[model samples]
Target chain A: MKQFEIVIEPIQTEQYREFTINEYQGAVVVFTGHVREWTKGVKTEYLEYEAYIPMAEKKLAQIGDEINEKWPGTITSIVHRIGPLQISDIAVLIAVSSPHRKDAYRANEYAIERIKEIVPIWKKEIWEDGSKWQGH
Target chain B: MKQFEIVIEPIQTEQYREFTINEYQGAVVVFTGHVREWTKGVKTEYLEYEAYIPMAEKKLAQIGDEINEKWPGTITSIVHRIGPLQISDIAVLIAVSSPHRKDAYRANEYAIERIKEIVPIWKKEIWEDGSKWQGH
Candidate 1:
């Protein structure tokens, strides 16, 4: 069992923990990614992330299925933010739970790899001097 | 900039999230090693992990320093159980956070690798046949 999620809103509160505990139990682990203070040679301004929602969702689902197929009954979830995000914003969150931890790590890494390899998420880096687009 | 933690008690409910959020405001990653269903030719009913506390703590701290010397600002927290743990019980929990996922992954892997290599934490397999000390 694997899941993918994207939180595209400002995380002034600890919503990530809430969502994580809600869906996962028995040794849940969460990973959060935020807007960085710098990028390239420029101090980062705000940044925007875009995704082809349908394809991205499909790929994410495939990651879940692959994990379960490889190791039954493992829960995997991936959440990524798609929009303008401020510094320290929660851009991505992934949580995995099972009877043990090795499967959890394996599934978490698998989810991220699948997202990077196939998901149609795009990034527009807004730097102090200029901006550029990033591919999936 | 680099972090490493190891806990040798029965894992608490919220400390996993607490330590992670406090150290890694933006992005965090965690990995766990759990007692397997079986090991060798025996069915594993459970496992007991033991450590020379003085040497183990020193080795753990060394792992953190090595991470700082090798990677970026990746804070880490590690917790492991010392008493008897069941098949599904957590043996170790490690959480790492950094500005970039690549560095987070790399540094986290390095920390675990170094711990397995240098730490004095030893594992004893409680099997249907017998129990013996080992490292994994």
Candidate 2:
């Protein structure tokens, strides 16, 4: 495991990608999240995301540790974005690496699934007429 | 849908990343695979890969199509290297974009999974003393 720059921002497509793929080889898996146009059957105006940075970072670190132990491969990089975002905004990015393609795919999937389920992040969804807080 | 390129070649790292992370906005995802020092029971000297170009092209095209159909995204790209490769040789690369990041992740994942199942590609293992073809 090497030190990779952990990114948290509104959205940056190019930077997010390059960071994920830098100097990696074998099988690399990338995961990205974007603002959806519709939510809860209503059109989304924007999404406001808030996070407790310290706790979130700790959770992310734990997730990385779990991935390495369970998958036993080199997970090169991961980037997560959170903030108020409009349509077409990127939300998160995760990249995984391994000597073979199988683990890369599996690990990439696992990271995102776990992040969504376990991370201490919350989203305030603003639809056409109203807004509400969502915690999951 | 827009056009994008996902290429894996033995170019200088800086040059390769420069092209990979070129001017792009919205969302981009990349994953890197690197060589590992160990394998089943021996140290690997190197690795070799081969692909049936015609069939591979078809499968790649299918992956692109699936991404478009399944996810709301554009500018999908994917590439794989086929030859003698050293550690840190990028074997597979997938980049995709959309107005949002979620679809980019969806399309990127779709591309890799489809490539593995359909692409007529094979790898040859070369260890310190012997070599063999890998199959699943």
Candidate 3:
């Protein structure tokens, strides 16, 4: 079971949940991000996601550790995809398992919020008329 | 893509996420409940879940509509499992997809909370020494 995963290929959100859940766990909360057809009313054609692989993986692992510290007995598994993606393509998945529902829900949300703030991943949205680079 | 689903067999959380997610949706939040090995320090051996099929399905559909009303463009899919289940067996899955992360998260959490309150499902936990009936 992988604790933190980063890949360029398309992501399967199902795989991560298996590793996070155990006999002692009662709840698993998962959050998946997809490349949408529209963003802020702009018609997006596609998205190209880029990341500093090494640093991104490190930050993801750090976030997992932070979740562990914040919520004891919670298990976190994260998988992020980078490279060209079309509309409806899955970009990231975060799974958290815990003995109780509340902890799993809280930790899963916190992990994604922290990833957006600290991870070194970026994306460029190609629209019908223009393209824009988002994130750093 | 159905907005509400109920099954007696084991629930596959991945399938519901797909039906709820679309090109216009950017975030998918999934909450899965499992049979735990312990409950309030009691060693749980297994669980037997039962539901009034007709009323339970009707209640589930009602929940889907409620979610749609509360979070306008959000799509929700709910699947509940019944019958005998072992430790770590998934019992319920709730998936919510929305154009924004916040709504998806909020709606997914609300779905589960409401299910516990309104659903007609009941369970019996078999422990090492004894057993107890739980839920309504």
Candidate 4:
């Protein structure tokens, strides 16, 4: 099972704790991308993220489908947040659940890797003195 | 940095989210083991986990030390729960954070595997018609 969402609000880690696990799942893995305060030796102030909603959702679901085929009985929930984010704020959450730990860990790792490659999300790194936008 | 604790209460996902990540970390990975209702086709009634607290904490911190050596600048927090747990109840939580996603994911996975190998924690599965204990 897969639940994918693109939201403007903050990504919640607590919510995904249940969404990713169930009666048959004994292992759950969650990965969160946060707004870092340091980048390339520079102090970061915050971050801004943007994405075209429709396609990003489609691609997230696409990753879900791929994961289902790769590791059977794995359930994943992904929520991505766009807009301004403060330091330590969660920008994206990817949670995976499976009957076993190996599959859950692998699937969760794959989700983040694929998200970066396939999802059309852009980010702006804001620093104390400067800022840069990626995938602009 | 590492935080390891053994408890009989429920694990909190939100608390570990902050403990594993900081201003320098951009990626955080959390892995949790839960009680499952279905085990090899039998309906699991519940589960009981027990650990020798003193050495168990030492082993968890030991895993933390190993992860630090293997992946520099990575922070990890691990918590293991004992006593009764119902379906979907969290049994163990392992959280790791790093500057990048790869290290965070890898460290998190390694922690769980190492916990199983070195940490002296045992599980008892209670089913509708039967029960069994592992690592007894």
- Every model's TM-score on chain B: 0.83, 0.77, 0.93, 0.94
**Segments in model 1 whose C-alpha atoms lie over 4 Å from true places:** A6-31, A65-76, A95-113, A124-133, B1-8, B12-27
Query: Would you estimate the TM-scores of all the predictions?
Result: 0.71, 0.66, 0.96, 0.93
* Candidate number that wins on TM-score, 2 or 4: 4
When sorted by lDDT, best at the front, the candidate numbers are: 4, 3, 1, 2
lDDT of 2 at B20: 28
- Each model's interface RMSD (Å)? 6.3, 6.6, 0.9, 1.1
Report the error of model 1 at residue A51, Å: 3.4
DockQ preference between candidates 2 and 4, better one: 4
lDDT scores in order: 0.64, 0.63, 0.87, 0.87
Cα deviation of B11, candidate 1, in Å = 2.8
Q: Is candidate 1 or candidate 2 better by DockQ?
A: 2
Clashing pairs in 3: none
TM-score, candidate 3, first chain = 0.95
Assess candidate 4 and give its lDDT: 0.87
Error of 2 at A17 (Å): 8.0
Badly placed stretches (over 4 Å) of model 4 are: none
Top TM-score model: 3
Best by DockQ: 3
Instruction: Please give, for residues B11-78, the per-residue lDDT of candidate 4 as tens digits.
Output: 76678878876788989988889888887777889999999999999999999999999999999889
**Candidate 4: pairs in clash:** none
Per-residue lDDT of model 2, residues A1-136, tens digit only = 2233234555343343344332333566666566667535677888887787777767777878888898874564555666787675656767676656677767777777788798877888887778999866
TM-scores of chain A, one for each prediction: 0.79, 0.83, 0.95, 0.93
